[PDB]
Write a protein that binds this ligand. Structure first.
Ligand SMILES: O=C(NCCCN(CCCCN(CCCNC(=O)c1cccc(=O)n1O)C(=O)c1cccc(=O)n1O)C(=O)c1cccc(=O)n1O)c1cccc(=O)n1O
Ligand SMILES: [Cl-]
Ligand SMILES: [Sm+3]
Length: 177
């Protein structure tokens, strides 16, 4: 039982796809340097900590995707599969049936230069609620003001105000491995 009110997901036509996406070059570790979405809310109290996400390309060209978070004084590891979707750089979540309430989960790589930064769009329908976010990934924990301004501009183009954009605080626990 619940009530919630969400900013509507944008149409996919507003979400670019990285041209000539290179699945091998996207592999390895990325830090989550920025997050924006309709369930992201900037909170001065308990600021969001940076986490890292590792993409490994499998034989069948799916990704094993592992996020590492520091929570309650320990490293917490979330492992899932991204299955290639309708075009290069687009994916859906593998094994959707295994996640209660989940009916769709879409990933689109918007832009990346592979060796410094990426922006990736996610849309999920869970218990019939449509959540979306944009993740700004960096190969390092810092990115330029330019890249952050680009991220903010892109987020706003998808109907997100500034208070639904956060920049997780760099940490050293867990994510330096
Ligand atoms: O709105 C979104 N995110 C902002 C709020 C995140 N959050 C607060 C943080 C929670 C902490 N965890 C989750 C870590 C564990 N994860 C999961 O066992 C998981 C299983 C199945 C689907 C799924 O999505 N998750 O996360 C992250 O920090 C984390 C890290 C890396 C990737 C990732 O996805 N998450 O969440 C939520 O509780 C939340 C609310 C609504 C939808 C949703 O998916 N999540 O995770 C969102 C929109 C569209 C796709 C999507 O995956 N997300 O998370
Ligand atoms: Cl992630
Ligand atoms: Sm999630």
């Amino acid at each position: 039982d619940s009530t919630s009110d969400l900013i509507p997901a944008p149409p996919l036509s507003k979400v670019p796809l990285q041209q000539n996406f290179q699945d091998n070059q996207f592999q390895g570790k990325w830090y989550v340097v920025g997050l924006a979405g309709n369930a992201i809310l900037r909170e001065d109290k308990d600021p969001q900590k940076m986490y890292a996400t590792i993409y490994e390309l499998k034989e069948d060209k799916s990704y094993n995707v592992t996020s590492v978070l520091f929570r309650k004084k320990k490293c917490d590891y979330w492992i899932r599969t991204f299955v290639p979707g309708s075009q290069p750089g687009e994916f859906t979540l593998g094994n959707i049936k295994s996640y209660p309430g989940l009916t769709s989960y879409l990933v689109r790589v918007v832009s990346t230069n592979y060796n410094q930064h990426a922006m990736v769009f996610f849309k999920k329908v869970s218990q019939n609620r449509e959540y979306f976010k944009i993740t700004l990934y960096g190969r390092t924990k810092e990115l330029t003001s330019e890249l952050k301004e680009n991220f903010i501009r892109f987020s706003k183009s998808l109907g997100l105000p500034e208070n639904h954009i956060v920049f997780p605080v760099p940490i050293d626990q867990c994510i330096d491995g």
